[PDB]
């Protein structure tokens, strides 16, 4: 039941999503090893993901969290990069999209820096890079990220390197 609606670059929604993508690039301590060497992106397309069933599943859970946290869902918009973006948009997030080895345990990870999610597009640590050229810094091949609505509720603060 998923449909994808193209946003026009003239659309204010296209523009605000593009700006969050571009403005949250940073340099990475691997010197580009995982995600490539770049300061900015060439945005090719932004599509709205529309699935009624997946939306209702999110809003149901959002209300539960909110009622457990003085009516505060603590909702954010955050980036997710994954080799499984096509399965996610059709079936939703589930245990198969977890980072089993992540530093905060087996869960589904999101980033405020778009450039941090970019490091996972081709797998953990960038895998072997693009399928076509085996290049983690490929400037040719098309990449995809998700910009997601995430319910944090009461969040455990982990100070960390």
């Amino acid at each position: 039941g998923t449909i994808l609606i193209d946003l026009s670059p003239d659309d204010k929604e296209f523009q605000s999503v593009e700006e969050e993508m571009q403005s949250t690039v940073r340099e990475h301590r691997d010197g580009g090893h995982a995600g490539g060497i770049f300061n900015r992106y060439n945005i090719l397309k932004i599509q709205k993901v529309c699935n009624k069933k997946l939306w209702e599943r999110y809003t149901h859970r959002r209300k539960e969290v909110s009622e457990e946290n003085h009516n505060h869902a603590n909702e954010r918009m955050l980036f997710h990069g994954s080799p499984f973006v096509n399965a996610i948009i059709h079936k939703g997030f589930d245990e198969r999209h977890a980072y089993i080895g992540g530093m905060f345990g087996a869960g589904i990870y999101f980033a405020e820096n778009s450039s941090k999610s970019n490091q996972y597009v081709y797998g953990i640590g960038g895998g072997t890079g693009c399928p076509v050229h085996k290049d983690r810094s490929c400037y040719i091949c098309h990449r995809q990220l998700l910009f997601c609505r995430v319910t944090l509720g009461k969040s455990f603060l982990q100070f960390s390197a």
Binding site: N39, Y58, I89, G107, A111, S137, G153
Partner: protein, 47 residues
């Protein structure tokens, strides 16, 4: 999937070394996220 720390719904990974890094977040229930935009892009070679 693991569980959230008791009495919590997510984990916030606060950067404590790299002063320029923003936060990363973890959730342990798939129903706590909706993939709202699909962005297709290329990274650009710096000049």
């Amino acid at each position: 999937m693991a569980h959230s720390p008791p009495g919590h719904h997510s984990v916030t990974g606060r950067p404590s070394v790299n002063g320029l890094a923003l936060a990363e977040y973890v959730i342990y229930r798939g129903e706590q996220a909706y993939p709202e935009y699909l962005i297709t892009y290329q990274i650009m070679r710096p000049e």
